[PDB]
Design a protein around this ligand. Structure first.
Ligand code: CDL
Ligand code: MQ9
Ligand code: MQ9
Ligand code: MQ9
Ligand code: 9YF
Ligand code: 9YF
Ligand code: 9YF
Ligand code: 9Y0
Ligand code: HEM
Ligand code: HEM
Ligand code: HEM
Lengths: 92, 203, 535, 223, 53, 164
């Protein structure tokens, strides 16, 4: 009970219109709170493309290329599922 | 604030109640004590065989097994049991200072037990057996050495609960914590009565 | 003759100069008392140690590459060819009284320096202490990190013990030759010859006593001037609006805790400069270019660099009659990360739209993508470091060496994505965890409801309550809200007596009533100031 | 003694002929050939404990010894009578010489350990990583005769530094270095391993920097 | 600025070391190269003796 | 200039034969301070000029300090407001003098090596009680004690010019 209230008038801000609403994340006006989602889609897809480029090198152990195919197919599957759900509006 | 909604004696409550209700950290440490007794059953079974194996004069030739330093530290530890029980008598009646004096001297002579056991290990390894040196030396170093880890963990519980008595109001929850650490460590030095009867007297 | 002479000399100082205006402006300056605002002081407080040891190390170290046989005291190096840098570094280790300690506490002060710079960069990153008014302060602090890293690398390579001589061969001469157009030219300009070119170690000694620490001292001076005059930032709290700094003043309180924290940083460095060996150059050898260790790993603040060599997967190019080797990439890559670490506030000023003069900090849960980009950078650093001791990890933690460098080589691509996901959603769930402590209360022990069988957690509200089981839900204010009634005034009254013996009860009553009234007066004065700001 | 050869044969039949074929041959893709390796090789590979082994993996690691010194002479003389190669150096008692092997110089041993092999292990003889799962082991728990017979007949992935590659003066000199580099205390503090900067970093963070941030949070408040 | 830097800028491709072809630069020249024609370059070990042979 | 002279000068007393370009010093024993000061003079492009304008800047420095001390003395610029300014300027003259003496003795050309032998080791031994002790602390040994020239280089790049 030995506490006071807290009141902070910041400089609130794009200016509070485009981004994420304050009910998706519970504090969106208090800082930068939404990466644009094409950036993370193309970042995952480019990450998986980089893991597929990583076959090209000094290389005799093909037990590694199955890990590269695996961690590339997982990222391509997550990016494709995520983009497909936003193309259908989070359905199935 | 307005006043509070959780208008209790502290932020910590007892554990349920203890007038017409069993104390729950009490029964928790009792069944965990019983589990650790089965852990010591594992260590005792690692002792009572590899003594049926060695025949004749079976505690081997480098093991001049010192009883004249063993029985003083057992006497220290079991008198320290009564100091710790006097500490919990001074914990039921609610004063932190009667708790802290008897648990400080219980921690000090439990530390004296740990240092006496460590000096017994030094004095018994420098002109005798090692844990890869013998069967009996190895089982002596593990059946009582991990008991050394039990009592050093109990000492950690003592110093930890003493800092806990430094930092908050003495609630009945903290008397529950005190009685729980009290007869955890009473279990430690009743297992050490069992081990001291087993290793040194009975052999 | 002790206060009268103080008054006489004070009136003499006020007679000669006129300082008291611009002294009262200084010792009424307020610094806020948050703990993280001491972190960068470690990067100051070890750095002075790096002078106070390092000056001492200058007047015994003899840089050269003239090859001398040892003929001293250390028996496993006798009659062996060594550079005179290594020979007089052995003389610092073994001849001079308390010499190994001063050079070890010097190396440990270098580690605490280049590690507290990283800790403090984490502070001012994740708390958002770098946007509009302090972005040039971020830039000169970032350059100060670069100079710290390169100057420490010039540091432990300054004796040419071969564990760091192979570090010069890897980093400072394999990457420097491996730059496409002007690579060999800047190599042969930096060395004056081949790799054991006879004017490398004195050039590093020249750059390492004065020429880089002169720039480091100039940037620390301008840096603490930017922190000083342009006022310090603060977390938002009770009486903490955008245009004030609350905390303690310099003269009674902050000077005492700052000097004491300097003394305790020096205590930690002295304890770990004595009790722990560092750079045991006698166990190492003189640098001869035909013998290596197995570790051959740099100091930790630069282990992300050649760990990035250890993980970049051998991609070389061959134009018409020439060669781009692997070492170009990390020469790009270290030029990449620094260009993201210098110029970050302008990057997210472009991305977000923060065109506002920010003085209050933002808690690192309140800004989830920036905390998540930061945790990408933290975990990418931890990966590039934790796969630079690739060798000794695969040694001790029994892993195939190829397997752990493939773990790093995939980890630098997928583990920033994993830690971005976990960091972003973990920041949002830390937001939601202290946005339900307002709509509900603070959690405690359980009461049952009386006439029926229910279980309510008996929440304790933080603001004003309504007539029923729910309070008026407060708004968020960027403050750390307490989630334990423990940390409120609940059960926080032990016996005041001693650790062993109680004080009499009237003294206990006086002490707890006086301390309770002082804490009540603290929150009363802060609350009425907060009402003075808005009312 | 022929009874000593018979004792070596009795221990040979009942420990290894699933992987050495009982004619001292090599069981193909299960255990290599064994003639010519000799008494020095069997002394290092059973006196350390390694070769009475249990799987064919990245490399067969160290372990407790499966036979004692009264039987290593039997087993090594049996493999030298069937094959023949390097022998373990022995003193004026006929037993395995372990203290007469430390040479009269250390600095030559320091430079020669450092040039010829400390690439693989470390400067003081701690372990080092190797290519595919295999690793150099620590030299601290190393009998000097095992060090001489380790470099004399190189077991797994190490070159056999022969009697003519390194002279026995040089090999006694290297085992003089490693038994007074893995035995001498770390001058000036705790030895954070033997290899420098990565344990020094990890003991900067959780010992030094965690204590520094703990002091910094005891001094300053939080708000 | 060139007076600052001009003392540093060495040409790595100035022919310095004598070689069998003539004077070659340093990067194309180890100590394994012949100096005039086929000369005996012995592959000698380094017995790590303090100075004598 | 002086920063530029730091990244070519190699202080030592390890005795090297010259084997460079300067013909009247070939095969002669020299300290490596003198050898790389010869390399500043003759190898590097515009090196003799930068070290000469460095020595002339040292002369104009330690002479203009004396000219300016004459100014603020004879014009009376040192009384009540500014006597502490006189004191720190005087100490700055002392450090200028001792630091320049560490300067031209930093190559051990023998015209200044005999200057070290006269001034820094004959007067230093010639102090009654603690003279030999501060001599053997300053040199670490005899007069060509092998850690004199690097100690002067240490005091002469940073430690005295930091105070200056
Ligand atoms: C036709 C289409 C094509 C075919 C598709 C196939 C169709 C579907 C097939 C199924 C796919 C197979 C995989 C199934 C898994 C899905 C199940 C699942 O997630 O649970 C649902 C659900 C998640 O909800 P959701 O359905 O995914 O939708 C949520 C949002 O819509 C989405 O959330 P969001 O919008 O916030 O997205 C976040 C994400 C965007 O999502 C993505 O698109 C993925 C992107 C990459 C993902 C990588 C892994 C991260 C994912 C988390 C994994 C943690 C492990 O962004 C990121 O966090 C990562 C950004 C990447 C940054 C770029 C990387 C740069 C690195 C630095 C470069 C340096 C290189 C050089 C270095 C040199 C330095 C100089 O999970 C839960 O809620 C609870 C989880 C319970 C776990 C139980 C499982 C057992 C656990 C055992 C322990
Ligand atoms: C050689 C050797 C073995 C290796 C080198 C190690 C090195 C020399 C260790 C010594 C470091 C140093 C000399 C010790 C200083 C620690 C001192 C200050 C103890 C602190 C005790 C405390 C009572 C000091 C009070 C501070 C006094 C009253 C004010 C001075 C003062 C200080 C000290 C500030 O840090 C400060 C920061 C920001 C604004 C103002 C101030 C300020 O006014
Ligand atoms: C526009 C507006 C919207 C502003 C926002 C965007 C803006 C901030 C973008 C930033 C710029 C972007 C990140 C590209 C800049 C990065 C570029 C490629 C600079 C890289 C430098 C590179 C070309 C030259 C290579 C030279 C390198 C850096 C030094 C060489 C080098 C040397 C000299 C060493 O001594 C050394 C020692 C030990 C290890 C390594 C090295 C090493 O790599
Ligand atoms: C804050 C963040 C860096 C954002 C910057 C902006 C970013 C976008 C710039 C681009 C960076 C990206 C592209 C590449 C990453 C490269 C990287 C950042 C190199 C720059 C150097 C520097 C800035 C490194 C980051 C700062 C550093 C990691 C902060 C320390 C971590 C935390 C927050 C401090 C508290 C930790 C403290 C309490 C000790 C805890 C103990 C833990 C186990 C320490 C972890 C640990 C560490 C961190 C070691 O360095 C280390 C080195 C050698 C051996 C062991 C360890 C070790 O165990
Ligand atoms: C602090 C806790 C950290 C916990 C991290 C736990 C690690 C996660 C899982 C790791 C799985 C490792 C499996 C490796 C098993 C293996 O040995 O496979 C090798 C190579 O595989 C690989 O590495 C591929 C696996 C890569 C893993 C993917 C990385 C995931 C990221 C997210 C983990 C990074 C974590 C880093 C933490 C740092 C801190 C961050 C905060 C094949 O090469 P190799 O063995 O040498 O050659 C063969 C001959 O030996 C053999 O005789 C012959 O038969 C041939 O096969 C031949 O090729
Ligand atoms: C108080 C009065 C002042 C007294 C001075 C106190 C300062 C200490 C220096 C005094 C001399 C002690 C150093 C001894 C000399 C010495 O170097 O210390 C060795 C290191 O050994 C070990 O580790 C075993 C030690 C285990 C003890 C506990 C480990 C220390 C921990 C706490 C360090 C923390 C590091 C950070 C953890 C990271 C966090 C991860 C999440 C131990 O030697 P030793 O055991 O006998 O044999 C070696 C073989 O370990 C060695 O494998 C062999 O190769 C040979 O070196 C052999 O000589
Ligand atoms: C910090 C600012 C960075 C600005 C860099 C750009 C500015 C460049 C200005 C320099 C122009 C040339 C100055 C005079 C030079 C000249 O005439 O160039 C001759 C043949 O080069 C050429 O034409 C090629 C010239 C093109 C320059 C290429 C190098 C550019 C940069 C990238 C190199 C990095 C340098 C700075 C980093 C080093 C860090 C140091 C801490 C050398 O033949 P050489 O026969 O070796 O003669 C030797 C005497 O030069 C020499 O002093 C003497 O010492 C003798 O050794 C003598 O042999
Ligand atoms: C796993 C834990 C298992 C059992 C713990 C038993 C605790 C009791 C310790 C026994 C003391 C003793 O008597 O050790 C005598 C011999 C001396 O022989 P030496 O060195 O060959 O002599 C030289 C002649 N040249 O111990 C030794 O081998 C050296 C090692 C010292 C004891 C081992 C470490 C003690 C603590 C273990 C860490 C617990 C981790 C728990 C994590 C969940
Ligand atoms: C040798 C390196 C460094 C030194 C001496 C140093 C010193 C300091 C000190 C003493 C403070 C005030 C105390 C505090 O606010 O925590 C501070 C704040 C600051 N530093 Fe650092 N720091 C260093 C590293 C860095 C780095 C790597 C950056 C980037 C940076 C940028 C800043 C900024 C923007 C502030 C103001 C933020 C604030 O007030 O909290 N500094 N620095
Ligand atoms: C800017 C911060 C500095 C850092 C991070 C730093 C770092 C280092 C490091 C890591 C070493 C190696 C120590 C060892 O392992 O033996 C070193 C050595 C040295 N330091 Fe610094 N240093 C700094 C500033 C200075 C300053 C300002 C001076 C002198 C005024 C100085 C003088 C020396 C000398 C002469 C050596 C070499 C002697 C030796 O290594 O034994 N350092 N430095
Ligand atoms: C404080 C004012 C200074 C004075 C009066 C001074 C004086 C001198 C003098 C007289 C010499 C001898 C030059 C010669 O005849 O060759 C010298 C050499 C030198 N100066 Fe300074 N100096 C000063 C500051 C500095 C600074 C600040 C640095 C470096 C950052 C520096 C670096 C050097 C070096 C390395 C040498 C020796 C190289 C050589 O003599 O060829 N000096 N100095």
């Amino acid at each position: 009970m030995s506490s006071t209230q807290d009141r902070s008038q910041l400089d609130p801000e794009v200016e509070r219109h485009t981004g994420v609403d304050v009910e998706d994340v519970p504090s969106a006006e208090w800082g930068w709170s939404h990466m644009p989602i094409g950036v993370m889609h193309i970042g995952g897809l480019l990450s998986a493309a980089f893991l597929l480029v990583m076959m090209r090198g000094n290389h005799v152990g093909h037990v590694e290329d199955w890990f590269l195919i695996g961690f590339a197919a997982v990222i391509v599957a997550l990016v494709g599922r995520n983009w497909w759900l936003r193309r259908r509006g989070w359905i199935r | 604030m307005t006043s509070a909604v959780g208008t209790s004696g502290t932020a910590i409550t007892s554990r349920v109640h203890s007038l017409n209700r069993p104390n729950m950290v009490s029964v928790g440490t009792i069944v965990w004590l019983s589990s650790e007794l089965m852990f010591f059953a594992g260590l005792f079974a690692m002792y009572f065989t590899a003594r049926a194996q060695a025949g004749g004069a079976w505690p081997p030739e480098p093991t001049e097994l010192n009883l004249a330093l063993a029985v003083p530290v057992t006497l220290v530890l079991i008198a320290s049991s009564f100091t710790c029980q006097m500490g919990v008598f001074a914990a039921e009646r609610g004063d932190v200072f009667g708790l802290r004096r008897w648990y400080v001297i219980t921690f000090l002579m439990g530390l004296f037990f740990v240092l006496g056991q460590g000096y017994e290990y030094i004095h018994l390894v420098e002109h005798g057996t090692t844990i890869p040196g013998s069967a009996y030396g190895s089982v002596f170093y593990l059946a009582t050495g991990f008991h050394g880890l039990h009592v050093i963990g109990g000492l950690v519980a003592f110093v930890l609960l003493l800092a806990r008595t430094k930092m908050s109001k003495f609630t009945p929850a903290q008397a529950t914590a005190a009685i729980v650490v009290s007869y955890y460590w009473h279990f430690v030095d009743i297992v050490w009565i069992a081990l001291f009867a087993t290793i040194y007297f009975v052999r | 003759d002790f206060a009268k002479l103080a008054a006489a000399q004070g009136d003499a100082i006020d007679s000669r100069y006129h300082p008291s205006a611009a002294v009262r402006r200084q010792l009424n300056k307020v610094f806020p008392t948050h703990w993280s605002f001491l972190l960068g002081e470690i990067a100051l407080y070890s750095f002075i140690i790096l002078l106070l040891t390092g000056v001492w190390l200058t007047l015994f170290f003899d840089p050269s590459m003239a090859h001398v046989t040892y003929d001293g005291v250390y028996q496993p190096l006798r009659g062996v060819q060594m550079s005179r840098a290594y020979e007089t570094a052995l003389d610092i280790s073994f001849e001079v009284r308390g010499g190994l300690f001063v050079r070890q506490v010097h190396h440990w002060a270098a580690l605490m320096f280049a590690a507290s710079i990283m800790v403090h960069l984490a502070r001012i990153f994740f708390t958002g202490a770098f946007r509009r008014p302090r972005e040039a302060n971020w830039v000169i602090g970032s350059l100060l990190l670069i100079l710290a890293m390169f100057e420490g690398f010039f540091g432990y390579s300054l004796p040419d013990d071969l564990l760091s001589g192979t570090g010069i061969r890897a980093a400072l001469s394999g990457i420097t030759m491996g730059i496409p157009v002007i690579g060999t030219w800047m190599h042969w300009a930096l060395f004056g010859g081949d790799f054991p070119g006879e004017i490398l170690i004195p050039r590093l000694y020249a750059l390492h006593i004065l020429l880089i620490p002169g720039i480091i001292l100039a940037l620390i001076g301008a840096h603490l001037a930017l922190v000083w005059f342009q006022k310090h930032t603060q977390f938002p709290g009770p009486g903490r609006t955008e245009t004030n700094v609350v905390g303690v003043r310099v003269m009674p309180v902050f000077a005492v805790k700052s000097g004491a924290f300097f003394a305790m940083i020096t205590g930690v460095l002295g304890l770990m400069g004595g009790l722990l060996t560092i750079n045991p150059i006698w166990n190492l050898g003189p640098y001869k270019p035909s013998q290596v260790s197995a570790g051959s790993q740099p100091d930790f603040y630069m282990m992300w660099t050649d760990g990035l060599i250890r993980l970049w997967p051998a991609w070389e190019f061959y134009p018409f009659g020439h060669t781009i080797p692997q070492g170009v990439w990390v020469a790009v890559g270290m030029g990449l990360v620094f260009a993201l670490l210098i110029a970050y506030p302008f990057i997210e000023k472009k991305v977000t739209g923060d065109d506002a003069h920010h003085n209050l900090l933002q808690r690192p849960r309140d800004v989830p993508v920036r905390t998540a980009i930061g945790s990408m950078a933290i975990a990418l650093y931890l990966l590039l470091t934790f796969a630079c001791m690739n060798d000794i990890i695969a040694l001790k933690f029994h892993i195939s060496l190829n397997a752990t460098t493939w773990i790093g080589r995939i980890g630098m691509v997928v583990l920033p994505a994993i830690v971005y996901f976990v960091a972003y959603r973990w920041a949002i769930s830390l937001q939601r965890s202290d946005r339900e402590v307002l709509e509900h209360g603070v959690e405690t022990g359980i009461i049952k409801r009386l006439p029926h069988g229910a279980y309510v957690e008996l929440h304790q509200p933080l603001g004003p309550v309504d007539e029923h089981g729910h309070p008026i839900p407060l708004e968020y204010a960027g403050a750390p809200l307490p989630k334990r009634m423990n940390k409120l005034g609940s059960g926080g009254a032990p016996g005041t007596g001693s650790f062993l013996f109680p004080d009499p009860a009237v003294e206990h009553e006086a002490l707890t009533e006086a301390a309770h009234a002082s804490e009540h007066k603290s929150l009363t004065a802060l609350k009425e100031h907060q009402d003075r700001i808005h009312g | 003694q022929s009874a000593l050869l018979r004792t070596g044969k009795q221990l040979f039949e009942t420990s290894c002929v699933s992987c050495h074929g009982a004619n001292l041959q090599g069981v193909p893709d299960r255990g290599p050939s064994l003639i010519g390796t000799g008494e020095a090789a069997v002394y290092f590979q059973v006196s350390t404990g390694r070769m009475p082994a249990m799987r064919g993996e990245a490399q067969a690691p160290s372990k407790p010894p499966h036979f004692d010194e009264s039987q290593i002479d039997a087993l090594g003389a049996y493999v030298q009578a069937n094959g023949g190669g390097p022998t373990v150096p022995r003193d004026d008692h006929g037993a395995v010489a372990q203290e007469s092997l430390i040479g009269g110089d250390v600095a030559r041993g320091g430079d020669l350990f450092r040039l010829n092999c400390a690439s693989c292990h470390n400067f003081t003889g701690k372990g080092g990583a190797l290519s595919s799962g295999k690793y150099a082991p620590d030299l601290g728990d190393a009998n000097p005769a095992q060090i001489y017979t380790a470099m004399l007949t190189g077991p797994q992935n190490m070159p056999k530094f022969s009697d003519r590659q390194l002279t026995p003066d040089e090999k006694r000199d290297i085992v003089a270095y490693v038994r007074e580099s893995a035995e001498t205390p770390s001058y000036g503090g705790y030895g954070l391993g033997g290899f420098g900067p990565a344990p020094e970093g990890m003991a900067m963070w959780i010992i030094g920097m965690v204590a520094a941030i703990g002091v910094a949070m005891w001094i300053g408040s939080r708000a | 600025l060139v007076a600052f830097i001009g003392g540093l800028i060495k040409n790595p491709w100035k022919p310095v070391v004598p070689t069998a072809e003539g004077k070659k630069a340093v990067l194309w020249t180890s100590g394994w190269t012949p100096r005039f024609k086929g000369e005996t370059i012995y592959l000698a070990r380094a017995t790590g003796r303090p100075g004598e042979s």
